Ligand binder design. Structure first.
Ligand SMILES: Cc1cc2nc3c(=O)[nH]c(=O)nc-3n(C[C@H](O)[C@H](O)[C@H](O)COP(=O)(O)OP(=O)(O)OC[C@H]3O[C@@H](n4cnc5c(N)ncnc54)[C@H](O)[C@@H]3O)c2cc1C
Ligand SMILES: NC(=O)c1ccc[n+]([C@@H]2O[C@H](COP(=O)([O-])OP(=O)(O)OC[C@H]3O[C@@H](n4cnc5c(N)ncnc54)[C@H](OP(=O)(O)O)[C@@H]3O)[C@@H](O)[C@H]2O)c1
Ligand SMILES: [K+]
Length: 338
């Protein structure tokens, strides 16, 4: 209540840098804050919109809701037994510093997820992943507040129903509010060097026997080189999920498009590079007034300054239609659209 803010600009709180207003904005620092905000949204008859760092979020209009910013803090080692180490972070912790924190303690598991923006609390929503690692690979459990009952529930790995950019919380939106997250990491050496550029850079810098810290630094360097920093150019990273198609459609697509970029899955279905499909549409480097497509990262929609969220969405809708027509493939956006 001391930090509660009315008719307040959300621009500092979304990486896209869209300027719309929140009816109320609350900065929750603990569970007691979260319950006060829930209760107040009830008192006022308002929806509640939860945000972390607003790095996977597209705001398209004034938010007639209580916006609840998760600013809880807290990082600890729960349990440290026989090289297996279980760690806990409060939802409001910044993801990348939590990763550096883990690595500096000699824990391996998160290095591939270095430098991803946002918070710990949002990380399970889309099962964050990069460089062949996903949160689910190290996920032990979380504690979530049931917004139907006001009761707490613990979610173990299976219960979250993790998938590619997916979870129970994305499927049943607006129900669970994640308070904290427990991950199981290791003290023994682990390297997931699946993606060639990581492997390649490590060899160029002459590290034949790398540690999880070396990988993290390499990953940070590649990411810095190639991803637009939101500070320069507002964005929410990859705007679309990579679609999965069956071998039927995959065969038919390949005949029509031999240069097609795809990764066949253990199930045998094919994951297409969304970026390739979009590039083939000619969208790369496109710009219409304040919105555009980045010139090297075809998945990244950008704000050159002053974009409305509606303009961003109109652009994404044009790209989706172009890809449906060209390839018969549906692209799903990744950022949550309000
Ligand atoms: C430059 C850049 C690079 C990125 N790279 C990656 C990447 O490599 N991999 C990747 O997976 N993502 C990436 N992202 C996307 C984003 O950083 C992650 O998905 C991140 O987890 C979102 O966290 P956030 O706290 O900003 O969530 P927000 O954007 O604040 O919100 C995310 C969704 O979760 C909900 N939500 C947030 N917090 C909670 C909570 N505590 N409880 C319940 N619901 C909640 C929100 O309502 C919203 O629906 C990138 C984004 C940017 C800008
Ligand atoms: N979600 C986001 O907002 C966001 C933003 C920036 C970067 N990233 C992630 O960071 C990594 C680097 O991103 P990037 O855009 O530069 O893509 P990249 O590394 O240039 O790879 C391009 C595309 O090919 C896939 N790919 C590449 N090597 C692969 C392999 N060995 N096995 C399976 N698939 C492979 C990636 O899928 P995946 O994306 O399925 O890994 C991605 O769709 C990727 O994992 C990407 O997801 C995500
Ligand atoms: K994204």
């Amino acid at each position: 209540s001391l930090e509660l803010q009315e008719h307040c600009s959300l621009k500092p709180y979304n990486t896209f840098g869209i300027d719309v207003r929140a009816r109320l904005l609350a900065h929750a620092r603990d569970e007691a804050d979260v319950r006060e905000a829930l209760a107040l949204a009830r008192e006022r008859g308002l929806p509640l919109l939860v945000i972390g760092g607003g790095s996977n979020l597209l705001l398209t209009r004034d938010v007639e809701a209580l916006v609840l910013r998760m600013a809880s803090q807290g990082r600890r080692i729960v349990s440290d037994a026989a090289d297996s180490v279980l760690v806990e972070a409060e939802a409001g912790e910044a993801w990348d510093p939590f990763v550096q924190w883990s690595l500096e303690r000699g824990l391996a598991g998160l290095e591939n997820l270095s430098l991803i923006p946002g918070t710990v609390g949002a990380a399970p929503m889309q099962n964050i992943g990069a460089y062949g690692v996903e949160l689910k690979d190290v996920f032990d459990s979380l504690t979530a507040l049931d917004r139907q009952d006001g009761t707490l529930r613990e979610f173990d790995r299976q219960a979250c129903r993790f998938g590619y950019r997916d979870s129970l919380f994305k499927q049943e939106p607006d129900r669970w509010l994640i308070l904290r997250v427990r991950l199981r990491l290791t003290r023994r050496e682990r390297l997931h060097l699946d993606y060639g550029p990581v492997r390649q850079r490590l060899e160029e810098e002459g590290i034949a026997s790398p540690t999880a810290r070396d990988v993290s630094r390499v990953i940070c360097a590649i990411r810095r080189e190639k991803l637009p920093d939101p500070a320069v150019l507002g964005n929410a990273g990859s705007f679309f999920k990579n679609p999965l198609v069956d071998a039927t459609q995959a065969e038919r697509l390949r005949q029509a498009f031999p240069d097609l970029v795809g990764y066949p899955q253990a199930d045998g279905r094919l994951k297409l590079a969304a970026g390739w499909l979009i590039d083939k549409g000619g969208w790369k480097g496109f710009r219409d007034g304040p919105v555009g497509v980045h010139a090297q990262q075809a998945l990244v929609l950008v704000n050159h300054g002053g974009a409305t969220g509606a303009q961003v969405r109109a652009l994404a809708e044009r790209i989706q239609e172009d890809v449906r027509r060209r390839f018969g493939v549906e692209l799903e956006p990744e950022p949550n659209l309000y």
